[PDB]
Design a protein around this ligand. Structure first.
Ligand SMILES: Cn1nc2c(=O)n(CC3(O)CCN(Cc4ccc(-c5ccco5)cc4Cl)CC3)cnc2c1-c1ccc(CNC=O)cc1
Length: 334
């Protein structure tokens, strides 16, 4: 396939899937290669550890290990990953690499790639008061229970909620008031991270939601924006499908990618990477009928696709870093 896998080194759950996803965000990968990690101590540095994983994923012929990386951000106990969501790990990783890019020539790469803006509003029904606030986001958690596809998820996510009764809004000078609450999307980022809400609480444990939930290859999002742009419609192309199979923690995590965005899909199952059909990356992961389904999707804005998937060569990795990692290998070999 020309792509290499990642080793199974414990119950790291989504971790390898997310690492392959981030590695094939080529613009992110190049920015990570530029990070000034010469002075870093290797035992403690997450940015250096992500640099290392990416370098190996780009050059290694054998499955890549991840032990230095998990040590660097300190999720080292038997159940450390079972106690966090995939977006929490992504946050830990991207926060580290963007704090490292402060003051550098690649500062802002993470906000530029993954941050969008929305508005959260409260409009009073019986008096004249509307409270607006802008929030940034790096990911979207989409409810699926009782929703047939992504589209109904986005409708449910922007739908109006009612505040009244014993839950009425405190409009300050206006006292308690009846109101509506809601969010609109102001900006959608070039890379769109969508978690699906498949891991829930039952009337008293946690259960997996294996319901059918359709997601498309091409996703139009113009109609969930507050104001659109005719020059850049909000059309996204499906880039990654992170899949879990099973109804409990004894399940198995894999990820399907079309790394180039050209519709040629591969299955990354830890150390095995294999060519797969389009039906097997997408429809076969809808759920419904089994227990195999998507819990997270990555989309790229078509207008930014080629810039986010720009070719990476080995002259993109600075020689200081190639030297440090090759010296690491050379000490490992003695
Ligand atoms: C409700 N909800 N569901 C979620 C979900 O599924 N994901 C994906 C995973 O993180 C978790 C499941 N993994 C797969 C798996 C592994 C084991 C089992 C299982 C079932 C029974 C025993 O073991 C079931 C599953 Cl599905 C893969 C990564 C991420 N976020 C989810 C949220 C959520 C909603 C709002 C906020 C607030 N945030 C901002 O306001 C924060 C989180």
């Amino acid at each position: 396939t020309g792509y290499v896998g990642l080793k199974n080194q414990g119950a790291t759950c989504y971790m390898n899937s997310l690492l392959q996803t981030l590695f094939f965000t080529n613009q992110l990968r190049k920015a990570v290669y530029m990070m000034p990690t010469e002075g870093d101590d290797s035992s403690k540095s997450v940015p250096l550890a992500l640099q290392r994983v990416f370098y190996e994923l780009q050059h290694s012929d054998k499955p890549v290990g991840t032990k230095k990386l998990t040590k660097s951000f300190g999720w080292e106990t038997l159940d450390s990953f079972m106690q966090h969501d995939v977006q929490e790990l992504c946050r830990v990783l991207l926060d580290n690499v963007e704090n490292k890019m402060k003051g550098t020539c690649v500062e802002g790469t993470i906000p530029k790639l993954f941050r969008g803006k929305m508005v959260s509003y409260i409009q009073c029904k019986e008096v004249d008061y509307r409270s607006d606030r802008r929030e940034d986001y790096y990911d979207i958690q989409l409810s699926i229970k009782g929703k047939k596809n992504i589209f109904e998820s986005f409708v449910d996510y922007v739908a109006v909620e009612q505040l009244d009764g014993d839950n009425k809004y405190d409009a300050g000078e206006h006292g308690l008031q009846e109101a509506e609450k809601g969010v609109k999307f102001l900006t959608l980022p070039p890379v769109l991270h969508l978690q699906l809400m498949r891991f829930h609480y039952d009337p008293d444990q946690n259960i997996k939601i294996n319901d059918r939930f359709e997601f498309p290859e091409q996703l139009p999002l113009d109609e969930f924006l507050q104001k659109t742009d005719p020059k850049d419609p909000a059309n996204y192309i499906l880039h990654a499908v992170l899949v879990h199979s099973g109804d409990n923690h004894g399940g198995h995590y894999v990820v399907y990618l079309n790394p180039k965005g050209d519709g040629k899909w591969c299955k990354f199952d830890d150390d095995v990477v294999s060519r797969c059909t389009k039906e097997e990356a997408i429809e076969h992961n809808y759920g419904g009928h089994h227990c195999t389904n998507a819990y997270m999707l990555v989309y790229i804005r078509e207008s930014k696709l080629s810039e986010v998937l720009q070719a990476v060569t080995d002259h993109d990795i600075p020689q200081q870093l190639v030297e440090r990692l090759q010296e690491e290998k050379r000490i490992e070999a003695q």
